[PDB]
Amino acid sequence: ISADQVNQIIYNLHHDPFEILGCHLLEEGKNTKKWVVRAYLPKAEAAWVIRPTERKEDPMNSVHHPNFFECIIETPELNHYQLKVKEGEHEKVIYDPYAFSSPYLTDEDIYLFSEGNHHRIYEKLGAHVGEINGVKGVYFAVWAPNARNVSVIGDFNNWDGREHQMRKRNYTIWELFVPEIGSGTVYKYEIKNSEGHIYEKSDPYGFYREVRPNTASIVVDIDNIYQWHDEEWLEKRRNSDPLKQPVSVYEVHLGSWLHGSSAEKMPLLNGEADPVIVSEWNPGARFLSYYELAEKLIPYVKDMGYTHIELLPIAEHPFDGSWGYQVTGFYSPTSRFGRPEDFMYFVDKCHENGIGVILDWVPGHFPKDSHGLAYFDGTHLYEHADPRIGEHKEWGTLVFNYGRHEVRNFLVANVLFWFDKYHVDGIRVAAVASMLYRNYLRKEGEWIANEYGGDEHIEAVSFIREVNTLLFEYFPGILSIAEESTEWEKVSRPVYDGGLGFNLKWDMGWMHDMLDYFNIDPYFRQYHQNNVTFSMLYYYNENFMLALSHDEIVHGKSNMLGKMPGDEWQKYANVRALFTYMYTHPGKKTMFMSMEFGQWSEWNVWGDLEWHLLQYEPHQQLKQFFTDLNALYQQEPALYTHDFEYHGFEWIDCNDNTHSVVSFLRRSDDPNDSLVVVCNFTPQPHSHYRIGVPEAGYYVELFNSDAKQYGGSNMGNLGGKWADEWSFHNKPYSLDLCLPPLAVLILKLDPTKVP
Template sequence: MDSLNLIKNDPWLEPYKTDIEHRFQLSVSKEKELAGKGKSLSDFADGYLYFGLHKTEQGWVIREWAPNATDIFLIGNFSEWKENTKYRFSKLKNGVWELKLKTGEIKHLDLYKLSMHWNGGHGERIPAWATRVVQDKKTYIFSAQVWSPSRPYKFKKKKFKPQISPLLIYECHIGMAQEEERIGSYNEFREKILPRIAKDGYNAIQIMAIQEHPYYGSFGYHVSSFFAPSSRFGTPDELKQLIDEAHASGIAVIMDIVHSHAVKNEVEGLGRFDGSYNQFFYGDHRREHPAWDSLCFDYGKNEVIHFLLSNCKYWLEEFKFDGFRFDGVTSMLYYDHGLGKAFGSYNDYYDGGQDENAITYLTLANKLIHEVNPHAITIAEEMSGMPGLAAKTEDGGIGFDYRMAMGIPDFWIKIIKEKKDEEWNPSAIFWELTNRRSDEKTINYAESHDQALVGDKTIIFRLIDDQMYWHMMKNDTNMAVDRGMSLHKMIRLVTLSTINGGYLNFMGNEFGHPEWIDFPREGNGWSYKYARRQWSLVDRKDLKYEYLGNFDEAMIKLVKDVKHFEQSPIIKLWDNGGDQILAFMRKDLLFIFNFHPFKSFTDYGILAPKGSYKTVLNTDSYTFGGYGLIDESIEHFTIPDPLYKKEKKEWLRLYLPARSAQVLKLQKRK
């Protein structure tokens, strides 16, 4: 066969041609095996329509896959939580069990579980395909719940096509998206937070912790019920309404989906669903994740692939999610989960330590998602740099639309912690922000939720620290605060302005939310103090948080208003390590950064396309908490230089205040 485009686009992959083409063939063969003749992956991924609890014309039917079970009973408040032959399942083929009930034998809001029997034991289980799971507020016990309202929510916006050029993501968590020390709701988010996001200009939200999880403090990453939206935040219908209204505001909704592992719990989760250790997960030493205290799916089983692919389609079809950010992809790709591996050469990606079953699953998942919704968005959270992860499946890639640029936040943390301000090197900054594969789109971000977790610090808190508690009043001059706010704006602007796909911000960080994120746990006395967002800080007119919020809104608008900004070439015009100056152009926008902590430059010369320029964004503006040193009303004209006549470049002479950035727009070419 001819080489795949993935290899053609990167000659350094030629030595690994056999491995890449082998993986491609594995996904092609597996798709044929699963879909069968004349059917598609989407047809195969209809498991959620067959398994689980469903209302029928005669009453109800519930089905579960439990090949190791010897007997199953449906128990609940309708049976006084006792086994009753009326609620006994019948065994069908291939490990499938079924129970049919008449109308009235169960009803809306009834609680239920499975009483599972196997050779040598039995136990209560929540159905694997349950779509509604609730926790008793007194006993803290989880149960499945019949969800069949008489007037189910109907989407008002039937069709929605994300406008994502560029993709501007507001990462959020429903529970902590409110100010009181408690868990927030879908309705509160829809009513209070969505308008903020729309005003800020973001065109997508990425919601964490949607799939039900027993422990709130896991941030939603220890999933127990994969088809159930977390009831902590409200009902399934309330989630649907949130998504519907987001679409009405032009905002795409991306789900942070967890298919990389599952919670170990047996009663609430899939740990030993039918009494066996290897139903959904590996049965050997690979079963438990060594770092996450969780269980690893066996992607080599068709039944597991069916479960997970059906899960993808379910969220797309039933809730109208616009795509997924797949969590923990690195862990899936490698048998050793990528732990302790440097990934310093291409050989590290093709040394035999890769889980081909997981790679096949991810390839099929991407293909399915785009088959169900051609406009869907898929993002990989992956740190190893696996080539082709965000390349098309037909080119030999794994098929994600974007990959997270996970090295960028690590770079910012490292430079803030280890470098003096006068050691910030513009060449190193530019290289880190633009070092990526040309055939794969990335999501740039300065910080996500990861950088804010307890034990770590947000960028603003690293820069200002405890001075934030005392010196964030607008009438208070403080050098540490001024420095921190200046760098906070510059870091975000240079990170956003160098995107080739999209940009992400975690909620509240746009206005410099102080402190860290810490969910209620035994170690903090089950406190919600740090599991919330203090929106009042940015709303108050006497605090400097408003300045940072204003800047973020202006920055987002600037980029959003440029059609296909992320696709435009980045042309470096100037970088000078001694002066700490960086300048580059994208289309008609000229971005200039002076990272020097104390040197301001008058009539600083930058070779730029000849013409006239006007200031369209300035981090030093009073509006953004700056010193107002730049006169934005001035139109700047380039000055000819015979040496650069052929290049059609001329000198642009500018005033560059220390620790500031400005964006100029080319008005007309000479």
């Protein structure tokens, strides 16, 4: 490029920057092509083009002006890239703002979509505000290859689409530009199938929707509604390994954390909306907006000291009682809580407070609701036609055809969509078994094996591996968390080693062992010491997340206090002992709303949590317990730097089944950060209980779950204990400890204490 062309850009004299900026073909070789990417990046000193799917990074060179950058790349196709921009000490990674000249589908878009490789198809499919033939309007496009006809109906044509019949491109996608209409436009697709049957559909790629039980899609100017402030958070995440840092997740169902009064409007960011009544049964109650939740949920979580909030599915879903797991609008955050920008505000505010956001994502199935993806164009389009692989008959739902390119693309681009437009920090997928197995909840003779005569769902395994590959390439440093309940191997291992590509797996065995153990009368725990210790035997096969989730405090299982035996005092002690053990055991941490203040009742999705309990000392003390334990967890490297290395854990002794006592070390990089954990899982206090420690010195009582401020009896070691030179548990030195009842101690050598 020439200096005059550059100067025309710098000084805003150029007639169309898209001629010069973005990705331009220079020449074709035999096997390859020469491309140039150009960017105008004012205030940037340096820049790179990332080809994340190819594992490649090329520097950009300043050309004629310090803020005008060129990068020449030889590669057959350059569809998938990001710009890295350095402004002083700070780096951001972005999509090229000059990637798309035109709002309409190109030959290239349609080709990539057909191969299932359009990682940004949601820029072109759906509804987009744009300019065609010199007029501002909205481009609509939808995949419906077998439709006889498709029309856009909406507010703008009184739901009569005779003048808004769409144009079929390449026998696969319907499009229409509509002039003068913009964001706020309420619309659906009217489809005639091959039999002449006419019916209405929500926009599969729709970015916003009316409030359930209404189903109309709404046009969003998704790139011009919110100003982000989280560049520093995103830089930090991209440049960190979340496996080497503290992850304590507060799991939340947004619709049932806290309700407001339905007698006022729902405040939004710089706006308001009609209240959304939580139900006909509880009509005085409304949901909080994403905006109110940003003002109330985020400081609450910040004060508790959790690192992450995990949301039950917020993709648009018709029925409250699905909890979100039955999705019909994969590309919009539910309108129950306001608008897309309100949710953007919520993620931005989490990032300002140093809190990450994980989404429950549901690529496994979708329900039969006629507004949604089911039998979309008069064929099994999104779902496989054979019900032996295309229905979960026990659930009444449909299974995506993962082998069909445009379906794979729908889902793969969907997971990227939440990281791109909503800046989320991870996903969790429930019931991965449901996807992995051809015989899942199917009886003999009602399923067919794969082409090798196995039960493995080959197309699903392949899909899951592509999701995790692309996710970590485009957004390094995220969390991809799986719950898989059948002992499938290498769930949280890289795809190159034959894994599924998650970086964490819920330890469901650990959950079952812990809740079965603490449910047992203390006298009888001696028959069940294996519940405490067994899960360290398979621990190193995956990167485990220790999750006590929503699923464990519904459907007659009781909330945590209700699972515990004894009087009120012992029930609380049991909770403190379990959670202190969970926070000191190797693995990341997940717990669900209500567990942190001792809600007695089960989680009820039709109401909000029992906040009135925090009027009373016992609930308050348990919340202070969790607050201090989260604080300890972020402050003690040995609790998080080596969760997944042998170095990080060693049993001291775990053979005293008779007294239900176990003890272990946690270690980190610095030997002086080592922690001695001692667990007493009966109400029998011990005056003198010897534990081997690795070195002489004073061992501080860093934490004691029986402290009086947690609702305990306040027994312990009055600040700490000097190690005797007294061989015990194959260790040179030992502590003569007081063990409080139904309690866990954490002790740390203070190597600079005065003898």
